[PDB]
mmCIF file of C-alpha atoms in Angstrom:
data_model
loop_
_atom_site.group_PDB
_atom_site.id
_atom_site.type_symbol
_atom_site.label_atom_id
_atom_site.label_comp_id
_atom_site.label_asym_id
_atom_site.label_seq_id
_atom_site.Cartn_x
_atom_site.Cartn_y
_atom_site.Cartn_z
ATOM 1 C CA UNK A 1 0.000 0.000 0.000
ATOM 2 C CA UNK A 2 2.871 2.368 0.792
ATOM 3 C CA UNK A 3 4.440 1.466 -2.556
ATOM 4 C CA UNK A 4 1.232 2.279 -4.447
ATOM 5 C CA UNK A 5 0.444 5.471 -2.523
ATOM 6 C CA UNK A 6 4.024 6.701 -2.812
ATOM 7 C CA UNK A 7 3.886 6.249 -6.581
ATOM 8 C CA UNK A 8 0.647 8.190 -6.939
ATOM 9 C CA UNK A 9 2.446 11.050 -5.176
ATOM 10 C CA UNK A 10 5.137 10.856 -7.850
ATOM 11 C CA UNK A 11 2.784 11.074 -10.805
ATOM 12 C CA UNK A 12 0.739 13.978 -9.424
ATOM 13 C CA UNK A 13 3.877 15.984 -8.636
ATOM 14 C CA UNK A 14 5.061 15.151 -12.150
ATOM 15 C CA UNK A 15 1.777 16.600 -13.411
ATOM 16 C CA UNK A 16 1.386 19.557 -11.097
ATOM 17 C CA UNK A 17 4.756 20.295 -12.716
ATOM 18 C CA UNK A 18 3.167 20.138 -16.172
ATOM 19 C CA UNK A 19 0.451 22.699 -15.516
ATOM 20 C CA UNK A 20 2.489 25.065 -13.341
ATOM 21 C CA UNK A 21 5.245 25.196 -15.958
ATOM 22 C CA UNK A 22 2.567 26.331 -18.406
ATOM 23 C CA UNK A 23 1.369 29.215 -16.234
ATOM 24 C CA UNK A 24 4.943 30.427 -16.554
ATOM 25 C CA UNK A 25 4.317 30.187 -20.301
ATOM 26 C CA UNK A 26 1.658 32.885 -20.078
ATOM 27 C CA UNK A 27 3.873 35.254 -18.073
ATOM 28 C CA UNK A 28 6.771 34.622 -20.502
ATOM 29 C CA UNK A 29 4.858 35.204 -23.735
ATOM 30 C CA UNK A 30 2.828 38.179 -22.487
ATOM 31 C CA UNK A 31 6.038 39.897 -21.379
ATOM 32 C CA UNK A 32 7.685 38.953 -24.675
ATOM 33 C CA UNK A 33 4.746 40.493 -26.564
ATOM 34 C CA UNK A 34 5.302 43.769 -24.693
ATOM 35 C CA UNK A 35 9.031 43.833 -25.455
ATOM 36 C CA UNK A 36 8.439 43.433 -29.190
ATOM 37 C CA UNK A 37 6.294 46.577 -29.175
ATOM 38 C CA UNK A 38 8.414 48.647 -26.738
ATOM 39 C CA UNK A 39 10.666 51.184 -28.459
ATOM 40 C CA UNK A 40 13.147 52.994 -26.199
ATOM 41 C CA UNK A 41 12.785 56.395 -24.575
ATOM 42 C CA UNK A 42 15.228 58.352 -26.750
ATOM 43 C CA UNK A 43 13.425 57.352 -29.941
ATOM 44 C CA UNK A 44 9.929 57.854 -28.582
ATOM 45 C CA UNK A 45 10.380 60.968 -26.404
ATOM 46 C CA UNK A 46 10.911 63.435 -29.256
ATOM 47 C CA UNK A 47 8.092 61.772 -31.204
ATOM 48 C CA UNK A 48 5.856 62.292 -28.177
ATOM 49 C CA UNK A 49 6.122 66.065 -28.527
ATOM 50 C CA UNK B 1 46.952 31.759 65.803
ATOM 51 C CA UNK B 2 44.315 31.019 63.163
ATOM 52 C CA UNK B 3 44.849 33.088 60.020
ATOM 53 C CA UNK B 4 42.139 34.065 57.539
ATOM 54 C CA UNK B 5 42.556 35.292 53.975
ATOM 55 C CA UNK B 6 40.639 37.262 51.357
ATOM 56 C CA UNK B 7 39.574 35.554 48.126
ATOM 57 C CA UNK B 8 37.915 37.214 45.134
ATOM 58 C CA UNK B 9 35.324 35.308 43.124
ATOM 59 C CA UNK B 10 35.491 34.210 39.501
ATOM 60 C CA UNK B 11 33.758 36.829 37.362
ATOM 61 C CA UNK B 12 30.807 35.035 35.783
ATOM 62 C CA UNK B 13 29.591 35.662 32.253
ATOM 63 C CA UNK B 14 26.221 35.789 30.505
ATOM 64 C CA UNK B 15 25.001 32.330 29.507
ATOM 65 C CA UNK B 16 24.490 31.328 25.897
ATOM 66 C CA UNK B 17 20.718 31.750 25.685
ATOM 67 C CA UNK B 18 20.916 35.275 27.103
ATOM 68 C CA UNK B 19 23.413 36.463 24.506
ATOM 69 C CA UNK B 20 21.996 37.856 21.279
ATOM 70 C CA UNK B 21 24.243 35.546 19.235
ATOM 71 C CA UNK B 22 21.594 32.810 19.641
ATOM 72 C CA UNK B 23 19.372 34.641 17.158
ATOM 73 C CA UNK B 24 21.753 33.188 14.548
ATOM 74 C CA UNK B 25 21.597 29.572 15.732
ATOM 75 C CA UNK B 26 18.868 27.116 16.693
ATOM 76 C CA UNK B 27 19.487 25.518 20.072
ATOM 77 C CA UNK B 28 18.560 21.950 21.017
ATOM 78 C CA UNK B 29 19.890 19.929 23.951
ATOM 79 C CA UNK B 30 20.791 16.453 22.738
ATOM 80 C CA UNK B 31 21.453 14.608 25.995
ATOM 81 C CA UNK B 32 23.660 11.777 24.706
ATOM 82 C CA UNK B 33 25.752 13.123 21.833
ATOM 83 C CA UNK B 34 28.851 11.095 22.704
ATOM 84 C CA UNK B 35 26.944 8.084 21.344
ATOM 85 C CA UNK B 36 26.320 9.712 17.946
ATOM 86 C CA UNK B 37 28.548 8.738 15.011
ATOM 87 C CA UNK B 38 27.088 10.959 12.268
ATOM 88 C CA UNK B 39 24.071 13.089 11.508
ATOM 89 C CA UNK B 40 22.706 14.075 8.149
ATOM 90 C CA UNK B 41 20.089 16.279 6.527
ATOM 91 C CA UNK B 42 18.711 15.307 3.138
ATOM 92 C CA UNK B 43 17.220 17.983 0.897
ATOM 93 C CA UNK B 44 15.097 17.152 -2.144
ATOM 94 C CA UNK B 45 14.832 20.209 -4.379
ATOM 95 C CA UNK B 46 12.255 19.929 -7.146
ATOM 96 C CA UNK B 47 12.642 22.452 -9.918
ATOM 97 C CA UNK B 48 9.996 24.050 -12.160
ATOM 98 C CA UNK B 49 10.535 25.160 -15.741
#
């Protein structure tokens, strides 16, 4: 029983891993979308006037 | 003629729990440590991606 129930703790923690490494995928790609459309200050400041 | 003398006491010092150095260490009293051979701590660091 302690071999079974210690192997179901492996496969959940191998699969909590799978979802919670995909919530990092949101935060990566959303930040990488912002950096593709973020020109620097010195270019954009004089265009702001 | 019975002669008496003057003795000065040993100047005592603050014990270890009443010094502020024990904020840096965690104190346990292991009664029989001369029987111990080794002691270990085993970390298991899971890593997300």
